[PDB]
Amino acid sequence: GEYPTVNEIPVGEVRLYQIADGVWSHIATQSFDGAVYPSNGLIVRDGDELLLIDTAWGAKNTAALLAEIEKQIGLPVTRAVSTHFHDDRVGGVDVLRAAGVATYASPSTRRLAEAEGNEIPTHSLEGLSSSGDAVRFGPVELFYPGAAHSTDNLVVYVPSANVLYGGCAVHELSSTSAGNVADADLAEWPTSVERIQKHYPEAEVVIPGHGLPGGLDLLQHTANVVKAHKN
Template sequence: MARLGLLVALLAGCASAPVAPYAHPTADDVAPGEIALRQIRPGVWVHVSTSDLGNGLIYPSNGLVVRDGDGVWLVDTAWGEAATAALLDAVEAEIGLPVRGAVATHFHDDRVEGADVLRQRGIPVYASSLTQRLAAAEDNAVPSDSLAGLTVPGTAVRLGPLEVLYPGGGHTRDNLVVYAPGAGVLHGGCAVHEMARTHAGNVADADLDAWPESLRLVRERYPEVEVVVPGHGYPGGAELLDHSIEIVEAAQQD
């Protein structure tokens, strides 16, 4: 389940109105199995869930909810089946629109662990074929639907209101980023770190050599991005891409 490596790594180490860190839900605000929604742009919400990694460490994870007309799309499941069920309840109660589908940005359990819950509700979960294979090999929940064409760095597909980009290897070999062009919001997943992070984190499945160039490709493709949401921690702006490049390049020297 890739949790031990994540625990060790963690212990080691916008538009008209910028994202305010103090307003972003933290592990103190969200218990495991629960969910918090925070609207960051019109039609775009961050969903925050947490997991107990042991030794008293409760760690948060970010995904997105993006409006698509009279429905919404999810970027990543919540962290766990109970939290994903809570996410669906929160979307119904706070947004009031049905979930059309979801996309998983890589194979780790903080991105896919609720895939079976969504499938049981008739909600497709899209991912690259590589993510499906890696999730199955890790004995994680496997996204139900494959996105074709995401095999070469720089390739992208449209999924409702979202552009799903494969920038190349990074935090994992299969990591994707997801851009909501109508809102200027980029979900970087775990390829992108919050500003408070000073270490590359869990690199057990990483491609450290490719990671900085993958992030440069993202930066060049979306120069107009206004809000960048990392896989964990506080959102920010495009500076998160440069920050992540810096700390990954430092990790290459370790």
């Protein structure tokens, strides 16, 4: 009941929310087709450093994210991973790289970001090209579940806390619509959700790309939302 909502965060400001010991989400707001939406990413403590998952959707928000981290946590962000190629995930990568953050994404994401004209993470993550593939990256596991919201979408698991960050492949429980599906695979999305369910059965917290965290129910709910859209 305390997670910040869209009407609570002016565009340009960033909030942090403690999810578990050494795990936070970051929440920002920005504009799509003239309407303001909230957007989440993740921060995971990596010894005396931090791993960032996703930008805060643009340059101004990403600079505000780094400032909020400086104030709230006080550990340096040394690496970031973007979970797909859209600008709510890579927009602000240039701000990160000018702050000394090493930025990473799969080659699939990098190719799509390049073709879209979005900022491109510096480094390429091999080992994620086939559905069900996983790689460990610092304190997280990166998992490619197959095409869903996008063909390159990754999910991120924090094994120390049983936290699953679904990114835009996972919708919040209040969702009654499927959001921007222009780059989605509506047929494969339920199969990709099933793979996440099977791979992370112990997840205690599930964080969507937009909206409120909850439990494992966000996964089946997402498949249901997508089916309602498809039909």
